[PDB]
Design a protein around this ligand. Structure first.
Ligand SMILES: O=C(O)c1ccccc1Nc1cccc(Cl)c1-c1ccc2c(c1)CCO2
Length: 136
């Protein structure tokens, strides 16, 4: 197997900045205690690609989570805040677009490479949070 464009995401990343994450979590429906503990976390994200399977691991003092998926193919995901969601992740012009559906609700998480950073934009009903990761 040769290189893939998505290899640009592969590596070990650490959170360096976060904006509006509490408001994003409020819009998602996260309860008070989870919002406070999750908002304190400074996760590391580990992204790897093996064939068609992309794996994203998140490790923090709050929770450790992992998803593996194939682009375009829906999967079950239990989120760090304990939502059971149906997820589909696709690549749109270099951006990983992750849609989560649950309880008649929907949120979109976009992950993109900007300069040497990995920028994560979380969007729910007009509320956006931007989380910036740098190489660990
Ligand atoms: O956090 C990110 O950048 C992030 C990116 C893409 C997608 C989700 C992300 N985070 C969260 C989103 C909603 C609710 C929670 Cl609770 C978290 C979270 C908050 C802290 C935490 C974890 C998850 C796992 C490791 O620690």
């Amino acid at each position: 197997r040769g290189s893939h464009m998505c290899d640009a995401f592969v590596g070990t990343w650490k959170l360096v900045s976060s904006e509006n994450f509490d408001d994003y979590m409020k819009e998602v429906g996260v309860g008070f205690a989870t919002r406070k503990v999750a908002g304190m976390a400074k996760p590391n994200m580990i992204i790897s690609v093996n064939g068609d399977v992309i794996t994203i691991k998140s490790e923090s003092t709050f929770k450790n989570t992992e998803i593996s998926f194939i682009l375009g193919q829906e999967f079950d995901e239990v989120t760090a805040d304990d939502r059971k969601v149906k997820s589909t992740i696709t690549l749109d012009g270099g951006v990983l677009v992750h849609v989560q559906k649950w309880d008649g609700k929907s949120t979109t998480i976009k992950r993109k490479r900007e300069d040497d950073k990995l920028v994560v934009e979380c969007v729910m009903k007009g509320v956006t949070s931007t989380r910036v990761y740098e190489r660990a």
